[PDB]
Amino acid sequence: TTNNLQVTYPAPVAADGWEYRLISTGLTAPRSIVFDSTGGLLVLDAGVGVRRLTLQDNGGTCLSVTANATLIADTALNHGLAISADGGTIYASTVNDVYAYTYNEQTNTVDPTTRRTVVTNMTNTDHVTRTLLLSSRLPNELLVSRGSAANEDPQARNVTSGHSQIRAYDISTLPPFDFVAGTLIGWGLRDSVGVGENPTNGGIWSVENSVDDLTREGVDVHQDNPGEELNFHGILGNTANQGGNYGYPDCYALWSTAGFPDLGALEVGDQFASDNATAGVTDATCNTNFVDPRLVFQAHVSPLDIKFNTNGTTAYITFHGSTDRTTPVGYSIVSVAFGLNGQPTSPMDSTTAANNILTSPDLTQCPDDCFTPVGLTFDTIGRLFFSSDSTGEIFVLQQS
Ligand SMILES: *[C@@H]1O[C@H](CO)[C@@H](O[C@@H]2O[C@H](CO)[C@@H](O[C@@H]3O[C@H](CO)[C@@H](O)[C@H](O)[C@@H]3O)[C@H](O)[C@H]2NC(C)=O)[C@H](O)[C@H]1NC(C)=O
Ligand SMILES: *[C@@H]1O[C@H](CO)[C@@H](O[C@@H]2O[C@H](CO)[C@@H](O)[C@H](O)[C@H]2NC(C)=O)[C@H](O)[C@H]1NC(C)=O
Ligand SMILES: *[C@@H]1O[C@H](CO)[C@@H](O)[C@H](O)[C@H]1NC(C)=O
Ligand SMILES: *[C@@H]1O[C@H](CO)[C@@H](O)[C@H](O)[C@H]1NC(C)=O
Ligand SMILES: *[C@@H]1O[C@H](CO)[C@@H](O)[C@H](O)[C@H]1NC(C)=O
Ligand SMILES: [Ca+2]
């Protein structure tokens, strides 16, 4: 490599058979990342806009950033970033709007005047990120995620508010869509920041940042509950397993049974009534009217992205890390094994489905001396790249 970048905190530990390298540093707050057609890495640097890193590639993890330009300067862009399959359009989001920009791959420039607003009316308080995903199987379909306005948001009970949900938009048909004009992929999703497509079948998957301060029969159980969730939303362009309500704010998934008041026949993975559920809602109601997660993960690990490998055998998820637990959790990259039907190989009650790929050597140091993984992407040869927003870093990760 050109440069020898090193981390400034006790370094991530790779599982056996993996290796990594830090390749960019001094970014402000890097969120979503994607490759352009010319081998450049586009970085949604929150509060700055979209930056393009030029990389030199000597094979394996031997990559070096040789240059960087700001393609789009806009301080409102806070997370979401996508690029068309032909490479000629960039989509990026603010709290309120999803913009499309023409991207000139001959120059590697974007003319600001080319900006059009494709989706709008998304603004709300608290969860302000708007994850963008373009389908591979249906390349005209743009998915957009949008969280709650508060930890327990009552407007998430009203589907027309557009809070706590994922929408799909046919961009080929485009005066922006209104947020709630899109096909409904899911609602009752508090903050499903990570959304991905499994190539095995085009199955749509999201990962949930579930509720804080969880009380159960008035007892505080927030330390180990509720679960973070892997949720399944069917395939794009069909309604099976899609558009349902995944619980929030009425129902939450169970991670840890021990010391859980009013367990009943509840198992790991099953949802239960929130103490603050609307008048009438019970556990049976959670069981019959709301869509359960397909897997759960350790409470508060805070997943932010999910990406599958070319073959669909494995998904990789970023765990950005807990902020409210006495002993912190997350601060890792994990993988989840998937089968031929495009479902996880683990049962929905498993507590061991997340396999560690890259971890913080000592959780007691986090957040302050730990990476906080956010964005993931694959290059053309299957190498995995990821962002760490709080340390201003980009890493490459691969099997050795
Ligand atoms: C259901 O709704 C209730 C009511 O909003 C939520 O209760 C909140 O629980 C937290 C405990 O984590 C309370 O915070 C604490 O308040 C006391 C004062 O009594 C203070 O000494 C503590 O340091 C802490 O700030 C919070 O006040 C309470 N909120 C209220 C009464 O407004 C509960 O978390 C919700 N249940 C869920 C999300 O499962
Ligand atoms: C993007 O490019 C700029 C231009 O080279 C880099 O800015 C230099 O950064 C180093 C940081 O150690 C300074 O010593 C130089 O003075 C900077 N030069 C200028 C002209 O500002 C910047 O580091 C690059 N950023 C990333 C994230 O790669
Ligand atoms: C539902 O959502 C829309 C939000 O725009 C609003 O017009 C309506 O009054 C809301 N409340 C309901 C149906 O309870
Ligand atoms: C946003 O919603 C408001 C209603 O509050 C409406 O005036 C406006 O037409 C919407 N914008 C678009 C582009 O749909
Ligand atoms: C798919 O991807 C991974 C990485 O190449 C590999 O370990 C796995 O064996 C592959 N599966 C199939 C069915 O080819
Ligand atoms: Ca749920």
Numbering used by the authors: 27 to 200, 205 to 430
What do the authors say?
Here we report the biochemical characterization of the AA12 enzyme encoded by the genome of the ascomycete Trichoderma reesei (TrAA12). The three-dimensional structure of TrAA12 reveals important similarities with bacterial soluble glucose dehydrogenases (sGDH). TrAA12 preferentially oxidizes l-fucose, and weak activity was measured against d-arabinose (11.6% relative activity), d-galactose (5.7%), l-arabinose (2.8%), and d-lyxose (2.2%). Based on these results, the AA12 family of enzymes is likely to have a catalytic mechanism close to that of bacterial sGDH.
The polypeptide chain observable in the crystal structure of TrAA12 covers amino acids Gln24 to Asn435. This domain folds as a 6-blade β-propeller. The three structures superimposed very well, and no major differences in the main chains were observed. All the structures solved present a constitutive calcium. This calcium stabilizes a long loop which joins sheets C and D of the fourth blade. The calcium ion presents a typical octahedral coordination. Three amino acids are directly involved in the coordination: Glu259 and Gln301 with their side chains and Tyr276 by the main chain. Three water molecules complete the coordination, stabilized mainly by the side chains of Glu238 and Asn26. Of the seven predicted N-glycosylation sites, five are visible in the density maps on Asn94, Asn147, Asn184, Asn306, and Asn341. The two longer N-glycans, on Asn94 and Asn306, come close to the symmetric molecule and participate in crystal packing.
